[PDB]
């Protein structure tokens, strides 16, 4: 087919071709292609790419969108726990997911690493912060009605506003195991009481960035999975450190370009996703030079 073509693009490390090439293929087409390639060459397509092109945010976005979604969420979690835990990356993978998605993950993990996902969290992730409770509860509780809207709206405007130290497990559970419809209400109630949006109240209350972000992600998910994905991309765009912002931006693009392709509709809250991609990602560092376009391509914003 055109399998030989890409196969030559990857050896030549012609990052520019790879983008256009990848622009043609669709979700299912891609999976097909990936296995076809491995038969016609004897090379597992992803690892072959992760070994052919530079290394960094560009390689990241390509080695992510070019793969099976859950498979990726697995490699993201795998890498996120190495040294210190990349709460931003773990959060992304398990907060912006449907019950079925986390399920397929627990499964894909158990068979890629051998161990059960929920256990590794207990081992590697001590339960200290809102950040760590988010990682856990996201895989233990399921959204279910409490029928105490006004009651819960107080639970937040107290733990995020009045209380000295916010009961983290308390607040993470309220958001995680909350029904999307009850949450529309809870949230609306909170704005009335406090006069400020939960997002603000979170970011204002949690100095640690990973914790304010993780909480804000969970919160925006209960209001629209693409909104959670928008907030995340925005948090990546406004990050001053290039290695971090490109890292974050690559992952989020790589894990959600298809799943929540209309995230740019919600990004309007902060500006124009397409404009902000064109503006923010101007780096000249080799491994970052093409990310801008790989990113635009996977969001059909080009
Ligand atoms: Ca490489």
Coordinates of C-alpha atoms in Angstrom, one line a residue, residues 93-216:
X93 CA -5.5 9.9 31.6
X94 CA -7.9 8.9 34.4
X95 CA -10.0 12.1 35.0
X96 CA -11.0 12.6 31.3
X97 CA -12.4 9.1 30.9
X98 CA -15.8 7.3 30.9
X99 CA -16.3 4.4 33.3
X100 CA -15.8 2.1 30.4
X101 CA -12.5 3.9 29.5
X102 CA -11.0 3.5 32.9
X103 CA -12.2 -0.1 32.8
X104 CA -10.5 -0.9 29.5
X105 CA -7.5 0.7 31.0
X106 CA -7.4 -1.3 34.2
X107 CA -7.5 -4.2 31.8
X108 CA -4.9 -3.1 29.3
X109 CA -2.6 -2.2 32.2
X110 CA -3.0 -5.6 33.9
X111 CA -1.9 -7.2 30.7
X112 CA 0.9 -4.8 29.7
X113 CA 2.6 -4.6 33.1
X114 CA 1.1 -7.7 34.7
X115 CA 0.0 -5.9 37.9
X116 CA -3.4 -4.4 38.6
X117 CA -3.7 -0.6 38.1
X118 CA -5.5 0.2 41.4
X119 CA -2.7 -1.6 43.3
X120 CA 0.2 0.3 41.7
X121 CA -1.6 3.5 42.8
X122 CA -1.6 2.3 46.4
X123 CA 2.1 1.4 46.2
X124 CA 3.5 4.3 44.2
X125 CA 0.9 7.0 45.1
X126 CA 0.8 7.9 48.9
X127 CA -2.6 9.5 49.8
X128 CA -1.4 13.0 50.9
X129 CA -3.0 15.6 48.7
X130 CA -6.1 16.4 46.7
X131 CA -3.8 15.4 43.8
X132 CA -3.3 11.9 45.1
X133 CA -6.9 11.3 46.2
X134 CA -7.9 12.3 42.7
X135 CA -5.8 9.5 41.2
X136 CA -7.3 7.0 43.5
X137 CA -11.0 7.8 43.8
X138 CA -11.1 8.2 40.0
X139 CA -10.7 4.4 39.8
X140 CA -12.8 3.3 42.8
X141 CA -15.9 5.4 43.0
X142 CA -18.5 5.8 40.3
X143 CA -20.8 8.8 39.8
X144 CA -24.0 8.3 41.7
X145 CA -26.8 10.7 43.0
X146 CA -26.7 12.2 46.5
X147 CA -29.9 14.3 46.2
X148 CA -28.4 17.1 48.3
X149 CA -27.5 19.7 45.8
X150 CA -27.7 22.7 48.2
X151 CA -26.1 20.6 50.8
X152 CA -23.1 19.8 48.6
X153 CA -22.7 23.3 47.3
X154 CA -22.0 24.2 50.9
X155 CA -19.5 21.5 51.2
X156 CA -17.4 23.3 48.5
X157 CA -18.0 26.8 49.7
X158 CA -16.4 26.0 53.0
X159 CA -13.7 23.5 52.1
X160 CA -12.5 25.9 49.3
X161 CA -13.4 29.2 50.9
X162 CA -13.9 29.2 54.7
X163 CA -12.1 26.2 56.2
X164 CA -8.4 26.6 56.9
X165 CA -7.2 23.4 55.4
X166 CA -9.6 21.9 52.8
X167 CA -10.6 18.3 53.5
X168 CA -9.1 16.9 50.3
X169 CA -10.6 13.4 50.3
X170 CA -13.9 15.1 51.1
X171 CA -13.7 17.5 48.1
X172 CA -12.3 15.0 45.6
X173 CA -15.1 12.6 46.3
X174 CA -17.8 15.2 46.0
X175 CA -16.6 16.0 42.4
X176 CA -15.5 12.5 41.2
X177 CA -18.5 10.5 42.4
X178 CA -21.0 13.1 41.4
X179 CA -23.7 12.8 38.7
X180 CA -23.3 15.1 35.8
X181 CA -26.9 16.4 36.2
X182 CA -26.7 16.9 39.9
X183 CA -23.3 18.6 39.4
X184 CA -24.8 21.2 37.0
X185 CA -27.0 22.1 39.9
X186 CA -24.3 21.9 42.6
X187 CA -22.1 24.1 40.6
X188 CA -24.8 26.7 39.8
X189 CA -25.6 26.8 43.5
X190 CA -22.0 27.4 44.5
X191 CA -21.6 30.4 42.1
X192 CA -24.7 31.9 43.9
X193 CA -23.4 31.4 47.4
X194 CA -19.7 32.4 46.8
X195 CA -20.2 34.8 44.0
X196 CA -17.2 33.3 42.2
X197 CA -16.8 30.2 39.9
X198 CA -15.6 26.9 41.3
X199 CA -12.6 27.1 39.0
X200 CA -11.5 30.4 40.5
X201 CA -12.2 29.2 44.0
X202 CA -10.0 26.1 43.3
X203 CA -7.1 27.9 41.7
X204 CA -7.3 30.5 44.4
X205 CA -7.3 27.9 47.2
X206 CA -4.7 25.5 45.9
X207 CA -1.3 27.0 45.5
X208 CA 0.2 23.8 44.2
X209 CA -0.4 23.8 40.4
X210 CA -0.8 20.1 39.9
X211 CA -3.5 20.1 42.6
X212 CA -5.4 23.1 41.3
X213 CA -5.3 21.7 37.8
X214 CA -6.3 18.2 38.7
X215 CA -9.3 19.5 40.7
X216 CA -10.2 21.9 37.9

